[PDB]
Write a protein that binds this ligand. Structure first.
Ligand SMILES: O=C(O)C[C@@]12O[C@H]3C=CCN[C@H]3[C@@H]1C(=O)N[C@H]2C(=O)O
Ligand SMILES: [Cl-]
Ligand SMILES: [Cl-]
Ligand SMILES: [Cl-]
Ligand SMILES: [Cl-]
Lengths: 258, 259
């Protein structure tokens, strides 16, 4: 009867509080998705325990074994009752679990080190002097790889052919690369992460240009889960009570340095 | 067995081609939702008729009679199999129909006549010289009535007590009112519509400020519909192929009359 919530350690969505070793259970964690979890539970009348996804992954099906990892795997294989994380709503996932309507929208955007003479994807496309790239594996890369749009296609062919490599293994590396490259590298990533980092010391980065695309984060439950309907309704209510906006403002701006 | 699609005549989602009495059936109509409808049927493998909703409303429940009007009413009362329209996904509607994930996202924004000295809701709230309003009902009005935000609250109180009325009955009314009030009126409306009108002649309007909130339009089916799963999957596939983006670009920008 205690609901098992699975999530993932990703700031500012879910973080381990500074004195977590002095804290018990759910109080070890803070962040946007921790509050969201609490808000969901209140409007759904259930008790819950926060767990961190065992393998540190989101949810991907291995082409060969067909096994799901991450949070999606924890739902499908019955370790968790529900996922409350920055888990993107995608077709392959929707086919094996239920999604709430998205609690947050986002898109591909450009992170620059402040000073950089770039204001848009187009700016990036027309030049090579400032290197730019994405995570070496994931949707942003595939977006570029698959786009039929001129600008985005010129960016991809550029990125694929660039030497040395413009791809990074981790988000943290991308951001470092920006910060360390003295304004000669730009990074493509979730507008949400871009916005968050903009509010981080040493305050030396900046989101520019519009979003290139659009996707959504949703709460995830097993197909036919008794929780999903209430959970989805709770998402919509929260949005209409200004609460999701308030949460975002909280973790991004009110608690922002810079 | 042909799927009955309810939808609504709202530009540029669905539009009766001016020569429509020479045309017939689905081909009488064009626009973003007509294309969207076709993509969905193709991916869901079905055949459909487009039918404009008898009352021209989106979907709201009468406070008294408890009766659902509009496209929601058509789905809830079993008069249509699916609604493919700029139908905002909302709690009360979600409780009575099935929605797909959003095929398009939007938020409340500010339409001004070019040259109007207003850049934000904050700006609007801090003055009265320029009047500003919303549709006399719906998602946008409700947002202001309910807001706990100081700026939005002040705007609601102003709007509610403003004379003459700052509320308009229809989008066209609100657009015309902005267009003719010599920059003495700004309309608060869906960013999607704001963005479309921006690309229409006389090209005398402008969207300004950030969105005030976030919402999505979804495709609705009657609760429990066998169609709901497949359709929702299609929205995601279309979105991942970049197809939804291609369409919005098509009807908003490719076809823009303002350069
Ligand atoms: O990057 C991906 O392909 C997926 C995502 O992986 C994250 C990790 C690094 C950069 N991107 C984000 C993306 C996000 O916002 N949610 C994840 C997810 O939805 O699994
Ligand atoms: Cl965003
Ligand atoms: Cl990462
Ligand atoms: Cl928008
Ligand atoms: Cl109302």
């Amino acid at each position: 009867k205690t609901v098992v919530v699975t999530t993932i350690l990703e700031s500012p969505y879910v973080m381990m509080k500074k004195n977590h070793e002095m804290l018990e259970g759910n109080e070890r964690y803070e962040g946007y998705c921790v509050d969201l979890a609490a808000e969901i539970a209140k409007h759904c009348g259930f008790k819950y325990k926060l767990t961190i996804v065992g393998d540190g992954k989101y949810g991907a099906r291995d082409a060969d074994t067909k096994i799901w990892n991450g949070m999606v795997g924890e739902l499908v294989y019955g370790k968790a009752d529900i996922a409350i994380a920055p888990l993107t709503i995608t077709l392959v996932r929707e086919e094996v679990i239920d999604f709430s309507k998205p609690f947050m929208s986002l898109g591909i955007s450009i992170m620059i080190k402040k000073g950089t003479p770039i204001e848009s994807a187009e700016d990036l496309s027309k030049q090579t002097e400032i290197a730019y790239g994405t995570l070496d594996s994931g949707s942003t890369k595939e977006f570029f790889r698959r786009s039929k749009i001129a600008v985005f296609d010129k960016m991809w062919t550029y990125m694929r052919s660039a030497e040395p490599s413009v791809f990074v293994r981790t988000t943290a590396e991308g951001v470092a690369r920006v910060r360390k490259s003295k304004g000669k590298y730009a990074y493509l990533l979730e507008s949400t992460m871009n916005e968050y980092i903009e509010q981080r010391k040493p305050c030396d980065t900046m989101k520019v240009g519009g979003n290139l695309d659009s996707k959504g984060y949703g709460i995830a439950t097993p197909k036919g889960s008794s929780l999903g309907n209430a959970v989805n309704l709770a998402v919509l209510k929260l949005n209409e009570q200004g609460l999701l906006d308030k949460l975002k403002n909280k973790w991004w701006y009110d608690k922002g340095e810079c």
